[PDB]
Each structure stands twice: as structure tokens, then as C-alpha cells.
């Protein structure tokens, strides 16, 4: 960005006046990155009198900065956020960014439901417990559940493992570095298998889930950040531990900020910093707007075939509603 911030200094600041019910101040969120993380927090606290209404700035390609932010907040009771473009899950004793692994899992399972597919995969197990348990619990349904085998990551062993499942459509999640072994390995990359990974997040580098603003630029990110700050300030109207870096330990989180929607987006989070009823879309690359909000269903490309036959088992079958042998009666809900 660099000088872009100066532009962001005016427009987004003006965007505050878009919804500013008596906001005290919102001057700037100066980056002053200096290309270093070690003292970035040092100068962050140094600049941190008169408290601060709140400034957010963070963007690093390829998200292991959250714990430092959490410690800074604790050491200065800081509830401010920094970034929205990059995000990741963390449960630590502020932190508010677009991400929901469980939302991704439920969305993909929904897509499977209305797309009529049976997923017995596993990739390197970084925090495998979360995703695996989510899949297992969602297996306790009435339609899907045939594919439940698991897998493991690292070449011959990986090839044998991935060839021991097949089962047409498959999907796994892991880090990009570990992801590439998928293309590296039994070479069973047949077109009759579409894959979805939530863990890596980021973007391509097929079909996968991403945030609503993923296509949108940093402008909407700063708008959402300032809107969240304004909501928090309004809640406060109904102290950042003195912002001292040089009580024995502060303790609070989301004391005022609970939930709100702006820009047709439910800019809200759970007490656990979880995206509550968020909006996300799905990709389509040979990306494309394929994917969802209001706890509702959204899906384009209403296809009835499956590009299948990757193996002569589905045969075009049709007839007429004769009555003695062809019964056609109204179904809402589900068939009998």
C-alpha cells in the first residue's frame, strides 16, 4: 500500500461520517511498518496519549501474528483490531477477522446435499482435531456418510494411501507446502473428483470457499474495521490499561462489542471470536462466483448431471406418470 494509506486517510475517514453517531475522533491508522515485526509492536505501544479511538492496519502475504497482537492487547487492554485481509483462528486470553472453519464445513456439506454426492480424507494434521471432529459430528445425519475413512500426509506410501480410498469425489485440507504433495502423488488426479480445503484458506496457488470480501479490496476492509470501531464506541457510550509498555494483569474481552451488520454483511463475532452468521462464497477456477448468508442457501449452476461416469453406471431413465405404475404426488420438507 504505502502512499495508498494517504488516500485511505481521506475516503475511509470520510466513510466514518457515513455512520458517525457523534464519534469523538477517528484520525488515522498509520502503518509505519518499517518492514519489521520485532519492534512493530514496540512503536505500536509507543504511539499508543489520550488513549486511542482505535486504528487497524495489518497485511502480510502468506497469518502467524495473532499471538503477538493478543499479548499487546493484554499488556494494554487494547480492544482494537489490525487487519481483515489476512485472518486465522486462535483461542487466547481485539481479535476480530473474517474466518470460519465450521462455516466452511457446513457450507460444503450443504453444497453436497443439493448437489447429490456421497469424504474420507486427511492432510498432514495441523490441528486435525477441529476439522475431523466437525466432519464426524456432521456425519450423524440421514443422507451423507458413506465416505468416512481418513488419510495421512508425508511418496510411495502417500500414493498407496490416496489410492486406497478413491471413492470419486474427495476433499482434504492442509498447508500449501503439504498440499503440493497431493499433485506430486498414485497420480490419481482424475477429473471425476472435486476437492475443497479450508485449513490453508488464502486462495488458489477448482472449487473452494472464501470470505465475502475476498474478491473485495482493502477499501471494504478498512470500512468494516471503522464500522466495528464505531459500534464498539457506541456500546461503550451505552481505558486501555494505560497503554503502558515502558492492575497486575487485565482481564476482559468483547465487553461492549457484541454484533452488528453493515454493508449488507453481519459484521459480528462470538465471545470466542467466531464469525456469527457470516457471509462467504465459493470459487470456480478452470475464480468464479459459485457460492450464502442469512443462514440461507445460495447456489448458481443448477446442474442435474455430475460430470461423472469416471470409472457407465448412471443411465438416462424416463417414463410417464401412468398412475398404476408411475405415481407423482406433491412432496415441502422431503419425500416419503
Amino acid at each position: 500500500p504505502a502512499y495508498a494509506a494517504e488516500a485511505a486517510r481521506l475516503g475511509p475517514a470520510v466513510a466514518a461520517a457515513v455512520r458517525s453517531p457523534g464519534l469523538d475522533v477517528r484520525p488515522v491508522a498509520l502503518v509505519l511498518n518499517g518492514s519489521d515485526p520485532r519492534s512493530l509492536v514496540l512503536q505500536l505501544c509507543d504511539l499508543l496519549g489520550l488513549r486511542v479511538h482505535g486504528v487497524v492496519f495489518e497485511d502480510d502475504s502468506r497469518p502467524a501474528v495473532a499471538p503477538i497482537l493478543d499479548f499487546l492487547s493484554a499488556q494494554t487492554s487494547l480492544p482494537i483490531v489490525a487487519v481483515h485481509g489476512g485472518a486465522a483462528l486462535v483461542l487466547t486470553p481485539f481479535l476480530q477477522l473474517g474466518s470460519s472453519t465450521e462455516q466452511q464445513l457446513q457450507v460444503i456439506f450443504e453444497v453436497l446435499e443439493e448437489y447429490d454426492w456421497t469424504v474420507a480424507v486427511t492432510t498432514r494434521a495441523p490441528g486435525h482435531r477441529a476439522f475431523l471432529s466437525y466432519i464426524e459430528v456432521l456425519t450423524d445425519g440421514s443422507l451423507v456418510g458413506w465416505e468416512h475413512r481418513g488419510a495421512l500426509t508425508l511418496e510411495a506410501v502417500l500414493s498407496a494411501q490416496l489410492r486406497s480410498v478413491s471413492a470419486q469425489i474427495r476433499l482434504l485440507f492442509c498447508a500449501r507446502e503439504e498440499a503440493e504433495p497431493v499433485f506430486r502423488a498414485a497420480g490419481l488426479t482424475g477429473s471425476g473428483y472435486v476437492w475443497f480445503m479450508v485449513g490453508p484458506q488464502l486462495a488458489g496457488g477448482l472449487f473452494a470457499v472464501r470470505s465475502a470480501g475476498w474478491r473485495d479490496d482493502l477499501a471494504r476492509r478498512v470500512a468494516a474495521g471503522v464500522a466495528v470501531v464505531a459500534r464498539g464506541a457506541q456500546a461503550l457510550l451505552r481505558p486501555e490499561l494505560g497503554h503502558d509498555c515502558r492492575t497486575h494483569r487485565g482481564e476482559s474481552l468483547h465487553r461492549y462489542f457484541m454484533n452488528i451488520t453493515w454493508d449488507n454483511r453481519d459484521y459480528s463475532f462470538n465471545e470466542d471470536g467466531f464469525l456469527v452468521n457470516p457471509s462467504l462464497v465459493v470459487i470456480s477456477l478452470t475464480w468464479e462466483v459459485v457460492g450464502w448468508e442469512q443462514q440461507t442457501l445460495r447456489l448458481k449452476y443448477p446442474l442435474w448431471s455430475r460430470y461423472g461416469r469416471f470409472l457407465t453406471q448412471h443411465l438416462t431413465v424416463a417414463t410417464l406418470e401412468e398412475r398404476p405404475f408411475v405415481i407423482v404426488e406433491p412432496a415441502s420438507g422431503t419425500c416419503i
Partner: protein, 348 residues
């Protein structure tokens, strides 16, 4: 507290390009900023944490540098990740209660309730997983999930008492343990048929818990520093080296996890406290106590799977003090009822 570290660095070269050192900063912000610019994690010393999460930030920074330091003054390590596969030798609270059920599986009981915050959730889930004729304790009846610091928690003891048995288990903060112990005298004066089991610290901080009934090197950290640093000694890579540049190096040392994996694989190559998984040790031995009088006699050969009790085996409850029978049956029963002519005729 630096003499121990100085001796450790002196003894570092026993088996065999520098020897690390650190300065113990009480607070964390300055310790955090000095973590890297001062110098995988050759020094992993929590000096004397008088707080709870204060040892977390420097470890997180090292993980950001891919240096899984080994926590030393750690007993309840909520890391299992938020950090990056930080090393750790002392087993956490995770299995500290696990050993109980196996002991309980053969010592005295079969179905004894257990009690709870995140550490408690992890402990209870690990316990219930460990237990995959059959038996079950709280899983048979229930397990609590409460809020720390809730004074006057009387309904908890009340509902605990009314169950079939009096055998209980708990693991929580010092204040929570004290409150539950004090309530035990209330709400049917829990005892004479009840049991107790908590972390050794809970007993230690237990000023007022008599009937209730530990460590290997905790609170001493004396004879295990040597084997700890020795285990690091073999960490030397054979096949880059561990980079020491903080400023101007925004990337990540690809070597870091590469040799963290083998560090995990590394086993034995030591004695005494020495001799798994991710940042944890799969072996340890512990004793128990009965809290006779005002003395908490840490007597027991629990030693994981192998138990060798002796020396006044036990006087478990505060009321009985005799041999604990264990499971207790019930007399009163509540019975369903439905209206139907065959056998259900109801009139005013």
C-alpha cells in the same frame, strides 16, 4: 534465579557453536522484545512465574522464529496450536488425572463421579476418552462444567450428594478447590463414603481439606535441568543452522520444524528424570496422599500403570477413616406411571 542456569551452561558441553544464556525479566513486554534481539530455543527458562500465562508470549515469539522452547516451571500447560509445537518435558494436567481411573480401575472403585476452565475441559475429555464387565464414573452420572470463582456454589454439592455414590473427583484452581472443600462440610457434610483426587498443587494449596486424598521434580527443577539440556545436545542437525537474526529477517527458518520433528522422535539418551508425541513426555511416576490429620503424607507408588501402596495404606474419608467400601447403592426410587385400564385405574 540464575546460578542454576550458569551451572547448566557450564555442564552443557559434558558430552561434546556457542552455549546459550538468558536474562530473567519478570514482566513480559520487555522480555518479549528482548527475546530475539538478545540472541533452537537453547534457553527456555521461566525464571519464577508468579502469574499464569506470563510464560506464553516469549514462547510464542520463539515459535514465530520456529524455536520450540521447553517449558520448565510448567504444570498445567494449555498448549496441547496457538503456539507452534513448543517443546515440553514435564507432563501437563492432561493425563495428571488420567492415572486415577486406571488406579481406580483396580484399586477401590468402579463408578465414582469426577468434577471440572479450559484445562478442566481438556482433562475431562482426556479421561473419558481413556476409558474408551464395564464401569464409568461421572460418565455414568454427570460431570460439572462451571465458572471459576463462583462462591456459594451450593446446588453443585447438593446435586452431587443425591447421586447413588459419594466417590468424587475434581481438578480446578486453588480458590475453587477450597470453596468446594468448604461446601463439602455443608450440603450433607460430604464424607464417610466419599473420596477425593486432585493435582498435587491442589492438595498443597488446600489449607482446609482434611478427608481429601504428586510430583517428580516440580517446585525443585534441580536434577532435571542437566538431562533437559542433554536432550537438546543431540538436537544438533546432521543433514541450515538455527539463524540468529531478528531484525531484517521476515521469513521463517525452514530448518525449524524439520528438526523439531526429530526432537520429538528423540527418546532416551539420558537418565533419572529423562526417559514423546508433541511437546510432552510419555513417561512419569507419581505418588498419592490421604491427608491424615494436618499432614498430607505424599505416600504412594502409583508410578503410572504399576501401583505399590504401603505405609498406612489409607484412611480415606473424614467421617469413617476405615476401609472405603466404594460404590454405594440406593433405596428410594422414582417410578413412571401411565393411565390404562389393564393395570392403571385412577380415581379421585
Amino acid at each position: 534465579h540464575e546460578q542454576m542456569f550458569r551451572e547448566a551452561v557450564n555442564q552443557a558441553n559434558k558430552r561434546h557453536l556457542n552455549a546459550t544464556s538468558v536474562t530473567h525479566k519478570p514482566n513480559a513486554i520487555q522480555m518479549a522484545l528482548s527475546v530475539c534481539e538478545d540472541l533452537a530455543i537453547l534457553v527456555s527458562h521461566p525464571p519464577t512465574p508468579n502469574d499464569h500465562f506470563t510464560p506464553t508470549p516469549v514462547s510464542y515469539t520463539a515459535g514465530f522464529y520456529r524455536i520450540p522452547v521447553l517449558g520448565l516451571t510448567t504444570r498445567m500447560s494449555i498448549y496441547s496450536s496457538i503456539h507452534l509445537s513448543f517443546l515440553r518435558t514435564v507432563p501437563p494436567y492432561s493425563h495428571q488425572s488420567s492415572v486415577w481411573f486406571e488406579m481406580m480401575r483396580v484399586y477401590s472403585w468402579n463408578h465414582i463421579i469426577l468434577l471440572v476452565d479450559h484445562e478442566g475441559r481438556a482433562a475431562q475429555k482426556r479421561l473419558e476418552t481413556l476409558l474408551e464387565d464395564n464401569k464409568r464414573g461421572p460418565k455414568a452420572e454427570k460431570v460439572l462444567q462451571f465458572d471459576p470463582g463462583t462462591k456459594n456454589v451450593t446446588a453443585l454439592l447438593m446435586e452431587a450428594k443425591e447421586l447413588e455414590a459419594r466417590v468424587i473427583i475434581l481438578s480446578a484452581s486453588e480458590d475453587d478447590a477450597a470453596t468446594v472443600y468448604r461446601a463439602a462440610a455443608m450440603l450433607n457434610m460430604t464424607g464417610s463414603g466419599y473420596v477425593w483426587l486432585v493435582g498435587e498443587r491442589e492438595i498443597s494449596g488446600n489449607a482446609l481439606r482434611y478427608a481429601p486424598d504428586q510430583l517428580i521434580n516440580g517446585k525443585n527443577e534441580s536434577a532435571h535441568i542437566s538431562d533437559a539440556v542433554g536432550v537438546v545436545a543431540q538436537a544438533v542437525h546432521e543433514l541450515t543452522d538455527p539463524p540468529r537474526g531478528c531484525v531484517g529477517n521476515t521469513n521463517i527458518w525452514k530448518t525449524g520444524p524439520l528438526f523439531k520433528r526429530v526432537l520429538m522422535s528423540s527418546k532416551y539418551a539420558d537418565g533419572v528424570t529423562g526417559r514423546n508425541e508433541d511437546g510432552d513426555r510419555k513417561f512419569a511416576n507419581y505418588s498419592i496422599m490421604n491427608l491424615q490429620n494436618r499432614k498430607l503424607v505424599q505416600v504412594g507408588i502409583y508410578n503410572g500403570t504399576h501401583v505399590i501402596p504401603n505405609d498406612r495404606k489409607i484412611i480415606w474419608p473424614g467421617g469413617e477413616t476405615e476401609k472405603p467400601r466404594g460404590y454405594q447403592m440406593s433405596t428410594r426410587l422414582k417410578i413412571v406411571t401411565i393411565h390404562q385400564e389393564p393395570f392403571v385405574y385412577v380415581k379421585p
